[PDB]
Design an enzyme around this catalytic site. Structure first.
Site: not given
Ligand SMILES: NC(=O)c1ccc[n+]([C@@H]2O[C@H](COP(=O)([O-])OP(=O)(O)OC[C@H]3O[C@@H](n4cnc5c(N)ncnc54)[C@H](OP(=O)(O)O)[C@@H]3O)[C@@H](O)[C@H]2O)c1
Length: 305
Positions: A81, A261, A52, A114, A255, A47
């Site tokens: 997006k 990952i 980004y 988006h 991640s 994604d």
């Molecule tokens: N459509 C929209 O408006 C929108 C908004 C927000 C996000 N998104 C998409 O959704 C993706 C995911 O959402 P998000 O960026 O908010 O992050 P998320 O998936 O909620 O992850 C939050 C944090 O969790 C940590 N993490 C990942 N795997 C883990 C594990 N097994 N154990 C412990 N911690 C873990 C990561 O830190 P590390 O990197 O240090 O592992 C990450 O910074 C974004 O990258 C983007 O692609 C879209």
């Protein structure tokens, strides 16, 4: 198809996707390294977004894993997006074309609006049905195999689904969704319209200081998530991802860390019982981590409903 859901336009979406957003302070080359590691770990849905500022590195990672023989293009589901300054309908196709040129791909699997909060091409007032028609013409032209939306509430989805002349329903609504904001009612609605809900911030968000209150509880420190992790000898993150898969939500996980990952693909290796899911459903508390004046003040803010 294996570990995918069938979209309402016939294409298949893998149910676990890799989130590629990293804040500006992370060097751009990191998205190349981590997207290659995500493909190596078994992620097949990636994604990204114009916003980004990483589509060139994410696209190079995909092209590299294709070049070395690990995957074929048709094995990868890539999403980008349309950013909110490009809602005016004449801007939609050139924005997608720019995304394709950056990623060096001939098509995206999925192109989303988006967010419904239109911005000056300073807010803009744009009828998003006009934006959607322009999204439909991009699917007709072959630039996107599927089209969908992101950050829409029910009324905003209905405006599209009710549009005179509608050619293509959105295949998905990608929205903030996790055990403190599980979006049950919206999920039921999406299910009733054959629209997939895709969850972002499923692990509790990156907690970005620009828009997330640091006073907010940290989702992965939740005592129920932690207890269920102990019970299953998994981790709180894997409990949070597996909860989505069992309620029929496609789940993203960001991640940038090689161990985490690889850990996240273990979501397919275990399952939760009815009681576990009920314990997780009891955590719902209307907590959207994205909680800022720069969204809440907008005429088309989705949490108004
Ligand atoms: N459509 C929209 O408006 C929108 C908004 C927000 C996000 N998104 C998409 O959704 C993706 C995911 O959402 P998000 O960026 O908010 O992050 P998320 O998936 O909620 O992850 C939050 C944090 O969790 C940590 N993490 C990942 N795997 C883990 C594990 N097994 N154990 C412990 N911690 C873990 C990561 O830190 P590390 O990197 O240090 O592992 C990450 O910074 C974004 O990258 C983007 O692609 C879209």
């Amino acid at each position: 198809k294996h570990q995918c859901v069938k979209l309402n336009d016939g294409h298949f979406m893998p149910v676990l996707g890799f989130g590629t957003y990293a804040p500006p302070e992370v060097p751009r080359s990191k998205a190349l390294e981590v997207t290659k590691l995500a493909i190596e770990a078994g992620f097949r849905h990636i994604d990204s977004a114009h916003l980004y500022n990483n589509e060139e590195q994410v696209g190079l990672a995909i092209r590299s894993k294709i070049a070395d023989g690990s995957v074929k293009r048709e094995d990868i589901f890539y999403t980008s997006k349309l950013w909110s300054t490009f809602h005016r309908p004449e801007l939609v196709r050139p924005a997608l074309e720019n995304s394709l040129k950056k990623a060096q791909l001939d098509y995206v699997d999925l192109y989303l609006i988006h967010s419904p909060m239109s911005l000056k091409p300073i807010f803009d007032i744009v009828d998003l049905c006009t934006t959607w028609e322009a999204m439909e013409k991009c699917k007709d032209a072959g630039l996107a195999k599927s089209i969908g939306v992101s950050n829409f509430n029910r009324r905003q989805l209905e405006m599209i689904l009710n549009k005179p002349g509608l050619k293509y329903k959105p295949v998905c609504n990608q929205v903030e969704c996790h055990p403190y904001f599980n979006r049950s009612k919206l999920l039921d609605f999406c299910k009733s319209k054959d629209i997939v809900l895709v969850a972002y911030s499923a692990l509790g968000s990156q907690r970005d200081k620009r828009f997330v209150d640091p006073n907010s509880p940290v989702l992965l420190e939740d005592p129920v998530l932690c207890a269920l992790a102990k019970k299953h000898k998994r981790t709180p993150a894997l409990i949070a991802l597996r909860y989505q898969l069992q309620r029929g939500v496609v789940v993203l996980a960001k991640s940038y860390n090689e161990q985490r990952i690889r850990q996240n693909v273990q979501v397919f290796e275990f399952q939760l019982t009815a009681e576990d899911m009920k314990a997780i459903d009891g955590l719902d508390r209307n907590l959207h981590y994205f909680n800022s004046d720069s969204f809440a003040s907008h005429p088309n803010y989705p949490y108004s409903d």
